[PDB]
Scaffold this motif. Structure first.
Motif, PDB file in Angstrom:
ATOM      1  N   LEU B 160     -29.696 -33.317  76.460  1.00 10.49           N
ATOM      2  CA  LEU B 160     -30.713 -34.271  76.926  1.00 10.49           C
ATOM      3  C   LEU B 160     -30.079 -35.502  77.577  1.00 10.49           C
ATOM      4  O   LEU B 160     -30.516 -35.964  78.648  1.00 10.49           O
ATOM      5  CB  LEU B 160     -31.588 -34.706  75.747  1.00 10.49           C
ATOM      6  CG  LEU B 160     -33.033 -35.193  75.893  1.00 10.49           C
ATOM      7  CD1 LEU B 160     -33.361 -36.248  74.835  1.00 10.49           C
ATOM      8  CD2 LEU B 160     -33.384 -35.694  77.253  1.00 10.49           C
ATOM      9  N   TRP B 161     -29.079 -36.051  76.900  1.00  8.03           N
ATOM     10  CA  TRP B 161     -28.324 -37.203  77.390  1.00  8.03           C
ATOM     11  C   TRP B 161     -27.681 -36.918  78.753  1.00  8.03           C
ATOM     12  O   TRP B 161     -27.703 -37.758  79.653  1.00  8.03           O
ATOM     13  CB  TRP B 161     -27.237 -37.524  76.354  1.00  8.03           C
ATOM     14  CG  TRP B 161     -26.269 -38.604  76.733  1.00  8.03           C
ATOM     15  CD1 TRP B 161     -26.387 -39.941  76.475  1.00  8.03           C
ATOM     16  CD2 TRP B 161     -25.006 -38.435  77.404  1.00  8.03           C
ATOM     17  NE1 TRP B 161     -25.285 -40.613  76.957  1.00  8.03           N
ATOM     18  CE2 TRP B 161     -24.426 -39.714  77.533  1.00  8.03           C
ATOM     19  CE3 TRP B 161     -24.313 -37.328  77.905  1.00  8.03           C
ATOM     20  CZ2 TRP B 161     -23.179 -39.919  78.153  1.00  8.03           C
ATOM     21  CZ3 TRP B 161     -23.078 -37.533  78.523  1.00  8.03           C
ATOM     22  CH2 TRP B 161     -22.528 -38.821  78.639  1.00  8.03           C
ATOM     23  N   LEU B 162     -27.120 -35.720  78.887  1.00  2.54           N
ATOM     24  CA  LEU B 162     -26.446 -35.279  80.108  1.00  2.54           C
ATOM     25  C   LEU B 162     -27.459 -35.167  81.241  1.00  2.54           C
ATOM     26  O   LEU B 162     -27.261 -35.717  82.339  1.00  2.54           O
ATOM     27  CB  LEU B 162     -25.743 -33.915  79.832  1.00  2.54           C
ATOM     28  CG  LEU B 162     -24.246 -33.739  80.101  1.00  2.54           C
ATOM     29  CD1 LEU B 162     -23.830 -32.291  79.865  1.00  2.54           C
ATOM     30  CD2 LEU B 162     -23.866 -34.151  81.516  1.00  2.54           C
ATOM     31  N   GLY B 163     -28.577 -34.499  80.974  1.00  2.00           N
ATOM     32  CA  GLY B 163     -29.559 -34.265  82.029  1.00  2.00           C
ATOM     33  C   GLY B 163     -30.248 -35.559  82.441  1.00  2.00           C
ATOM     34  O   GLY B 163     -30.592 -35.779  83.616  1.00  2.00           O
ATOM     35  N   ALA B 164     -30.431 -36.450  81.481  1.00  3.68           N
ATOM     36  CA  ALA B 164     -31.152 -37.679  81.788  1.00  3.68           C
ATOM     37  C   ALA B 164     -30.280 -38.566  82.650  1.00  3.68           C
ATOM     38  O   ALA B 164     -30.779 -39.238  83.553  1.00  3.68           O
ATOM     39  CB  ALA B 164     -31.589 -38.426  80.500  1.00  3.68           C
ATOM     40  N   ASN B 165     -28.987 -38.594  82.328  1.00  2.00           N
ATOM     41  CA  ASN B 165     -28.007 -39.323  83.136  1.00  2.00           C
ATOM     42  C   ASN B 165     -27.940 -38.810  84.568  1.00  2.00           C
ATOM     43  O   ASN B 165     -27.901 -39.590  85.524  1.00  2.00           O
ATOM     44  CB  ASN B 165     -26.616 -39.279  82.475  1.00  2.00           C
ATOM     45  CG  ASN B 165     -26.416 -40.429  81.486  1.00  2.00           C
ATOM     46  OD1 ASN B 165     -26.368 -41.595  81.890  1.00  2.00           O
ATOM     47  ND2 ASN B 165     -26.319 -40.109  80.188  1.00  2.00           N
ATOM     48  N   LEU B 166     -27.931 -37.491  84.699  1.00  2.00           N
ATOM     49  CA  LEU B 166     -27.863 -36.847  85.995  1.00  2.00           C
ATOM     50  C   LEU B 166     -29.050 -37.305  86.801  1.00  2.00           C
ATOM     51  O   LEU B 166     -28.927 -37.791  87.929  1.00  2.00           O
ATOM     52  CB  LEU B 166     -27.927 -35.328  85.829  1.00  2.00           C
ATOM     53  CG  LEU B 166     -26.676 -34.541  86.202  1.00  2.00           C
ATOM     54  CD1 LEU B 166     -26.988 -33.061  86.361  1.00  2.00           C
ATOM     55  CD2 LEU B 166     -26.093 -35.090  87.463  1.00  2.00           C
ATOM     56  N   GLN B 167     -30.210 -37.166  86.185  1.00  2.00           N
ATOM     57  CA  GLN B 167     -31.457 -37.536  86.811  1.00  2.00           C
ATOM     58  C   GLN B 167     -31.561 -39.027  87.089  1.00  2.00           C
ATOM     59  O   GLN B 167     -32.166 -39.424  88.082  1.00  2.00           O
ATOM     60  CB  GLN B 167     -32.596 -37.122  85.896  1.00  2.00           C
ATOM     61  CG  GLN B 167     -33.916 -37.108  86.577  1.00  2.00           C
ATOM     62  CD  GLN B 167     -34.929 -36.349  85.785  1.00  2.00           C
ATOM     63  OE1 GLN B 167     -34.609 -35.746  84.756  1.00  2.00           O
ATOM     64  NE2 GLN B 167     -36.168 -36.373  86.248  1.00  2.00           N
ATOM     65  N   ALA B 168     -31.025 -39.864  86.198  1.00  2.17           N
ATOM     66  CA  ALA B 168     -31.080 -41.316  86.434  1.00  2.17           C
ATOM     67  C   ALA B 168     -30.252 -41.609  87.686  1.00  2.17           C
ATOM     68  O   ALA B 168     -30.629 -42.406  88.534  1.00  2.17           O
ATOM     69  CB  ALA B 168     -30.522 -42.078  85.245  1.00  2.17           C
TER      70      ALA B 168
END
Lengths: 189, 193
Positions: B160-168
């Motif tokens: 979740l942390w990884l994907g949210a960062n990517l998306q941010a």
């Protein structure tokens, strides 16, 4: 035809070595298309990139639409299928492979292409959200909070799990994400 | 010794800015102000250097994360939330988005030595195992509740942390991070009593 051909080999090549590194001549040789005709369809590499992303995202948007609106069973089954399909592909290149590849060069990407990546992602999220609010309304499923927020979580998880699968060379982050989604997007009482 | 760290540090800054495959040796040496023969005295090659770079990077991050989770302020639930809250804070500094090495180097694992991909896999496994231990501790002292096994839940938190960062990063909004934090708050809950 020829316009589509160019776009397709541009996506292939971008998938491999990224967009920024993909030289025009590399594109044209692979596509086997003379430089003159490229310019007939696209006034620049940048314009080409925009069209490439748009084609990529419209097609993915249409496949997602068909899965979540005309797939197997209720809306909960279709949401699960969105993760399950991502797995099924592996037997080993990840899904959303293009978004990920371009994520590493976004600062060097033109504004139009960055915008096209944003809209693609937002479109995917909007589809998930509509599926969530539907399943909620016909009691296929329940979850906490509003649909958009939850769709955003599902999208970020899918993206992170794909990346983690790619790094570890393993299905496990995907299977695990899917197991998690089964709890969070639950069958009702 | 101090030279060795200097090269590694410079390499990290440059990799973070333009990718690892993007970073050429001469750019690295000119930026570090270190002669070519000295580099080759410490590192067999660019590839060898990258492994050492990553190992250095993950060693330090693993320690920071350990201090946060094992002895931070409050209970294990508070500490887990702080992991996401810190991510929110360290998203950008002074206007400029301060990237994340794992996130940036994700899109290169395609084109990296097994030694480097493996260094990253190891990096990730370390974070996940720390989060997992925190979750288990939290259950054992009744700080927090959630569905399922600690490792499973830890892996989701990392994904979740990884994907949210990517998306941010892509959208230039911290909304994906705030949204991830709010969802963790609901998933990793305080016990009913």
């Amino acid at each position: 035809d020829t316009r589509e051909h160019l776009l397709a080999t541009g996506e292939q090549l971008s998938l491999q070595r990224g967009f920024t590194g993909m030289g025009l001549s590399e594109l044209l040789k692979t596509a086997e298309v003379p430089k003159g005709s490229f310019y007939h369809y696209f006034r620049s590499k940048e314009a080409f990139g925009v069209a490439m992303l748009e084609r990529h995202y419209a097609a993915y948007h249409q496949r997602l639409t068909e899965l979540l609106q005309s797939g197997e069973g209720n809306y909960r089954d279709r949401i699960l299928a969105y993760y399950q399909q991502t797995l099924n592909q592996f037997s080993g290149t990840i899904s959303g492979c293009l978004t990920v590849k371009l994520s590493a060069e976004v600062s060097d990407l033109s504004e139009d292409m960055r915008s096209a990546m944003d809209k693609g992602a937002r479109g995917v999220i909007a589809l998930l959200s509509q599926a969530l609010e539907n399943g909620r309304e016909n009691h296929s499923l329940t979850f906490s909070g509003e649909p958009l927020q939850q769709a955003q979580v599902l999208y970020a998880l899918w993206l992170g799990a794909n990346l983690q699968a790619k790094i570890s060379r393993s299905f496990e982050p995907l299977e695990n994400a899917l197991a998690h989604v089964k709890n969070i997007i639950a069958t009702p009482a």
